[PDB]
């Protein structure tokens, strides 16, 4: 059985083939317009890929239950607090679902060998990708499913760390009801995994940590001249 609240969250999920196809196409034209001597570095393509993912994340939030009831200023504060966390959570879940070991699956539908990416990503991003892979492995061993994924999406979006909100009560309420729905859902559907609910919640600080460090690295890369919506959110 599925709590009705979780069904309402599921109804807000985007059309994933369409989201990925749109991003794939954008990046294809990008490289096509570029002449022989001005192709995008691999880090550069990842920045544009992340940029375009953020557009789809904003569109998802905008139309989502509860979020669409916030005034725009509250909506902006929430997204500014969690945009990198939603990026990384989406990345992690993509590896959980489609991930083979030794490769990374991108929002474009491309599968890339890890040895290729690790050669170019540099020590810091390799470290953060490695931590993310550790979460992938843990979530895979717990049978992390789509109902739990959308719960964590809304728990990341409706964060209690965001202050100066006009309607903090709504954010507090969504946090509490989604938590209660996830606690109930994991019991009913995975009764033998006592640790599942706790193991899911403990990933959120870890994703937060990875995401905040990811932001700090990218802000450094921007200040260093190595990098749109991505810059605005930074």
């Amino acid at each position: 059985s599925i709590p009705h609240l979780i069904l309402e969250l599921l109804k807000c999920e985007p059309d994933e083939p369409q989201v990925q196809a749109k991003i794939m196409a954008y990046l294809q034209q990008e490289q096509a317009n570029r002449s022989k001597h001005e192709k995008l570095s691999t880090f550069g393509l990842m920045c544009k890929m992340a940029d375009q993912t953020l557009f789809s994340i904003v569109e998802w939030a905008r139309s989502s239950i509860f979020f669409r009831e916030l005034k725009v200023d509250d909506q902006m504060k929430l997204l500014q607090n969690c945009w990198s966390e939603l990026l990384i959570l989406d990345h992690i879940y993509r590896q959980v679902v489609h991930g083979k070991e030794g490769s990374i699956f991108l929002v474009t539908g491309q599968q890339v060998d890890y040895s290729i990416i690790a050669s170019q990503a540099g020590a810091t991003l390799n470290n953060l990708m490695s931590h993310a892979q550790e979460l992938v492995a843990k979530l895979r061993s717990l049978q992390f499913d789509q109902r739990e994924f959308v719960c964590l999406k809304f728990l990341v979006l409706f964060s209690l760390d965001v202050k100066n909100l006009e309607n903090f009560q709504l954010v507090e309420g969504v946090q509490e009801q989604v938590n209660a729905a996830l606690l109930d859902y994991t019991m009913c559907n995975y009764p033998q995994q006592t640790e599942k609910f706790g193991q899911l919640l403990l990933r959120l600080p870890e994703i937060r940590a990875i995401s905040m460090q990811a932001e700090e690295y990218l802000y450094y890369k921007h200040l260093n001249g190595d990098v749109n919506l991505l810059i605005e959110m930074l």
Binding site: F55, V58, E59, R62, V72, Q75, M76, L79, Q80, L229, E232, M233
Partner: peptide, 11 residues
């Protein structure tokens, strides 16, 4: 963040 406001307000 004018861009984020626009993405939330646009029709």
């Amino acid at each position: 963040n004018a861009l984020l406001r626009y993405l939330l307000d646009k029709d």
